[PDB]
Amino acid sequence: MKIEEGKLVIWINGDKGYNGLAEVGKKFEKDTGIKVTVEHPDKLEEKFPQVAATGDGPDIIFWAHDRFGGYAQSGLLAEITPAAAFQDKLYPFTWDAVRYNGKLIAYPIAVEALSLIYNKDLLPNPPKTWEEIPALDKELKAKGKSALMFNLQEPYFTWPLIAADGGYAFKYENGKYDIKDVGVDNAGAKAGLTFLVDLIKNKHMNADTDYSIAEAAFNKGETAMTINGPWAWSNIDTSAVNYGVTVLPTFKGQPSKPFVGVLSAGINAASPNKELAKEFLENYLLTDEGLEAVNKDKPLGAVALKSYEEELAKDPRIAATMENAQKGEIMPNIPQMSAFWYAVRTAVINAASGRQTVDAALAAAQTNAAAELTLQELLGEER
Amino acid sequence: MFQDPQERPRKLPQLCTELQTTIHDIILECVYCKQQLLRREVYDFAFRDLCIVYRDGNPYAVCDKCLKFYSKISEYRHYSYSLYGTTLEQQYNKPLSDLLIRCINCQKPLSPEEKQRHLDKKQRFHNIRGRWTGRCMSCSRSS
Amino acid sequence: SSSVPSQKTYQGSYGFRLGFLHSGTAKSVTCTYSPALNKMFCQLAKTCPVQLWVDSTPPPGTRVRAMAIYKQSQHMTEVVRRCPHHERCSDSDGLAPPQHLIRVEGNLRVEYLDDRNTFRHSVVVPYEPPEVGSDCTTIHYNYMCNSSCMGGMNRRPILTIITLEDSSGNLLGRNSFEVRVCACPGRDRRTEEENLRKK
Ligand SMILES: OC[C@H]1O[C@H](O[C@H]2[C@H](O)[C@@H](O)[C@@H](O)O[C@@H]2CO)[C@H](O)[C@@H](O)[C@@H]1O
Ligand SMILES: [Zn+2]
Ligand SMILES: [Zn+2]
Ligand SMILES: [Zn+2]
């Protein structure tokens, strides 16, 4: 077999705190003699299905729960079977995030949602509204600061604005998603995205701002506002840029509605170390001890483990996180989510540049994201 | 007739049985263009393992031209990526013979023989948002 | 006066339907299904995969029943039976009564019914949802006589009727397929499919 027996190889995203995870691995090694290697490869969410398909890859893959339906569907993931006693230690709704066609296909780790993070020193009073940002920008665009910088290359970051006034991915009803009912080219969708483009046609954010550019900018005090997740808080602490975490700005009347991710740990179907990986995840990572260790590197957000969550919930930033979360929506985990995300990332990039109108950018993504009813009936499958 | 969605035939041979007609004799309209199906198209519909579609309780089917036309449209919009057969076998840990692969052009489920040809000729399979597609023998060189 | 079981398609509340592998028509194949014919060709005692597809999950306690009936109307009332020869050849797996034509292999939750009113045989297993990485549930059936078995099916074609039912035996779903149990399923499927295009 391609995956080596008697070790654990874990893949987790670079923004997440692999050192703290690596530390939980150390404690595992020193107890069990089992070597644990933590890696953070680029384009993890893409690299994994590519190598796992060949029967290779990590024993354990971390990602938000939204990719996992596709992985499970492609046969890349083993069924997760926790004992009732363990299952009961985690919030039921986090288990729900990693249930797919009646089966658990990952361990939920922590609930993630974007918050508005602001420098009090530059803005003791953050705009609680999106519309008062072009005005507040040029106030600093001769100061000479930008008002707002956040990643513009990943639709995850722009999705709150585009969804605030009525955009949505797949319609949820009765416990099921209707893959034919997509809400990407509706009024509120085009609305939030035209607004976003009228921040770049108007020189108030640059079309090509990415995660790197935005994090530095905010952490070197050159912008007073940014949108980012709980993992970002560690590098802000070391920059000492005196910051607060708060409710995202409203667009028109509406709360800005981020897609909510549950960071999740899946077990590679081709791993000969499935029982090992369970041991490691249930008895080392998903413990007050384990999560704290990872959390101290990069904050996880609101952890699935009840006991530790109750400690973390006292934290005002976690309360902010969950306030944004309850205003947002849990991502679906269905296999069509990756196409949805590719279609929306394309539409947002092509409208911030100019190869398409907002209206035609979203017209195309809606088309590529929804299904054709009649051909699907002819084929006899909803795929 | 057939306006109970929880109780009408899915497949042509069962539709023929419930009409007490035969497949040689049944008359069917394409669901897209509404034209009547040619006899060879009726046969093709069965061999291609397609499903009877119902509009307003009436049973339709599909003609060759429309099938190919609306398939290509669906494929364009939902093409994900491509793989050689060898990776597919690793991925699902089964012989290709066990995976559902339809012809990208005519939608006929590929035979093991057609799947093998893909392997022998190093022809990739295409993933259409979860659907696996290849090319059958009759669509393998052009008509 | 005794009834013949319906073969009528019934998707029901959970959108029940059958599925099959595409196993081709090579002379070596032991089980192959023709969608054009809606017909399974298989060898005696070999594995015949039958896939169960639902649109929504049926409650646990749901059961899946298989039953053979003769396809030809003048034979429909005769109970499908193994021939005396095979019925008395000690070829039991330990679960199936030796007179049952249709067996389920690899499932200890299998039950065999001799219906006290109709005398028809059926084999039943609990419904289980698809495993991870599967979109359907597969039951492995075995047919324990040749279609030609004299004293048994006597070259008469049969239908296998699959029914989804609740714990009490109420009908949740039904589908069926013709079965021919023979020595060369590959060749027989090829033959009948060719004659289908000529008629
Ligand atoms: O931008 C699309 C992308 O969004 C989400 O990815 C998040 C991830 O959930 C976070 O934990 C963090 O790593 O930032 C990512 C965005 O760069 C989805 O989870 C992912 O599938 C999707 O492609
Ligand atoms: Zn047509
Ligand atoms: Zn073809
Ligand atoms: Zn016999």
Tab-separated table of N, CA, C and O and ligand atoms in Angstrom, chain C residues 44 82-83 85-86 144-146 149-150 152, ligand 4:
chain	number	residue	atom	x	y	z
C	44	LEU	N	-25.804	-20.653	-12.826
C	44	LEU	CA	-26.331	-21.237	-11.591
C	44	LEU	C	-25.369	-21.037	-10.418
C	44	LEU	O	-24.178	-21.281	-10.549
C	82	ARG	N	-37.264	-25.082	-7.109
C	82	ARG	CA	-36.109	-25.823	-7.569
C	82	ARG	C	-36.554	-27.210	-8.003
C	82	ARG	O	-37.464	-27.776	-7.409
C	83	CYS	N	-35.878	-27.762	-9.002
C	83	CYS	CA	-36.143	-29.111	-9.471
C	83	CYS	C	-35.822	-30.111	-8.366
C	83	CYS	O	-35.008	-29.819	-7.470
C	85	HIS	N	-34.080	-32.800	-8.345
C	85	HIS	CA	-32.669	-33.142	-8.276
C	85	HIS	C	-31.867	-32.173	-7.415
C	85	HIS	O	-31.212	-32.582	-6.473
C	86	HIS	N	-31.957	-30.882	-7.724
C	86	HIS	CA	-31.182	-29.868	-7.019
C	86	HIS	C	-31.690	-29.644	-5.597
C	86	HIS	O	-30.911	-29.335	-4.699
C	144	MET	N	-30.614	-20.844	-7.968
C	144	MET	CA	-30.080	-22.161	-7.661
C	144	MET	C	-30.522	-23.272	-8.619
C	144	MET	O	-30.237	-24.447	-8.378
C	145	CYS	N	-31.194	-22.904	-9.710
C	145	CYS	CA	-31.487	-23.855	-10.797
C	145	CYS	C	-31.276	-23.147	-12.106
C	145	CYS	O	-31.393	-21.931	-12.173
C	146	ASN	N	-30.929	-23.916	-13.128
C	146	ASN	CA	-30.986	-23.467	-14.508
C	146	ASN	C	-32.422	-23.243	-14.936
C	146	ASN	O	-33.294	-23.979	-14.518
C	149	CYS	N	-33.909	-26.323	-16.057
C	149	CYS	CA	-33.959	-27.467	-15.145
C	149	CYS	C	-35.272	-28.201	-15.291
C	149	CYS	O	-36.342	-27.647	-15.035
C	150	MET	N	-35.188	-29.451	-15.722
C	150	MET	CA	-36.388	-30.241	-15.901
C	150	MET	C	-36.890	-30.636	-14.516
C	150	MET	O	-36.136	-31.118	-13.669
C	152	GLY	N	-38.111	-28.350	-12.694
C	152	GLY	CA	-38.092	-27.031	-12.083
C	152	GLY	C	-38.688	-26.016	-13.031
C	152	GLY	O	-39.860	-26.106	-13.393
D	4	ZN	ZN	-32.325	-27.568	-10.996
